[PDB]
């Protein structure tokens, strides 16, 4: 038995940079507004994983009301507690700028660390909306993730 999940997160630019994405500080004119560290890749990743496990989402488990890497780790703990193991993950950063490609190899390493898995089971990509939409206008950054879990 195997399970699929999907996650999506967005944070708005504000304040001064750098931004943290996939656990990597990327220098930029602007920072990202958030309650946590605003790591849109790790949030989206975490929700895909919880979603595959039918454990809900970060919103339910970790209320903004009541850091991302730790949220990921705590989510994974619970998910492994349920008998699941990693199949793979794939992540899609949607952003006009800054350039992500230089920082992506390091993000894989970090995610692999956090999920206790091999780097070849983690992929991360960047894609632009060609100046369209709120990401295109540089109002914020969005990220999507998918995950496959095996029981």
């Amino acid at each position: 038995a195997m399970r699929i999940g999907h996650g999506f997160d967005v944070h708005a630019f504000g304040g001064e940079g750098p931004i943290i994405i996939g656990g990597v500080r990327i220098p930029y004119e602007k920072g990202l507004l958030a309650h946590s560290d605003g790591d849109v890749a790790l949030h989206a990743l975490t929700d895909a994983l919880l979603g595959a496990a039918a454990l809900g989402d970060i919103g339910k488990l970790f209320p903004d009301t009541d850091d991302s890497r730790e949220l990921l780790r705590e989510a994974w703990r619970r998910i492994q507690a349920k008998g699941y193991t990693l199949g793979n993950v794939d992540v899609t950063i949607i952003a006009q700028a800054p350039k992500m490609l230089p920082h992506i190899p390091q993000m894989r390493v970090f995610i692999a660390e956090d999920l206790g898995c091999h780097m070849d089971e983690v992929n991360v990509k960047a894609t632009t909306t060609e100046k369209l939409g709120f990401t295109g206008r540089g109002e914020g950054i969005a990220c999507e993730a998918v995950a496959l879990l095996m029981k």
Copy 2:
């Protein structure tokens, strides 16, 4: 033999509430403009399921230009799709749904959405996940113009 599918849908706000999402009537100051009842979550889910089964999409099965679907219950649409998918030899692995909305708050309603989806797919609640996420006031969902939903589905032959 496993198969994957992805779905995506959007409806604009207009009219008076409530809205219908994941089958649940949620109070809100506005309704959703739609040919059907406007259930973005069930639409996205139906497309993910049809996509995994390579049976096209809801635009093909349930076109808005057809007046027979006016006011349609999206749970009956889901059930109709799922009948075709099961006839084609498939059983459910799992589904994960991601509602994208600034408002109204969805988390209180997610448990009853899971109940309805699990009933409609004849599966256990443990194979249905629904999540809600905001765009932090950005974009059309952030400006409160409409609501989007995505879904992924895994099927087994």
Copy 3:
């Protein structure tokens, strides 16, 4: 040994049509602005396949800065990605694609898209699904500023 991947692309409209989506030339009052042919569907699909294979993305493999890709047939880019993926020991499970557009109408063209993709991947077209979905006049797609597409892919070792 299954693997999932996800892809997403966008191009902006400009000039006159036709556009090229899923390898098919579709008449439209507007064309797409892109270094390559602008095929958002095949780009998204290619990224999903590369993502399942932990091989990166098309921004890395086929950069707009490289004059070799000026006017590239996006099917060639797909095939070249697929050859790299197959050299890694992956086989196709299935793919599902989601075109996000206000217009033009995609449904008439989807059967040819599926023929093209199936041929390009060496697979049966029962393993390929393509869907279209509107944002109902919302957002950049809704306002007719561009087209988006998403894809998911499942591979096996």
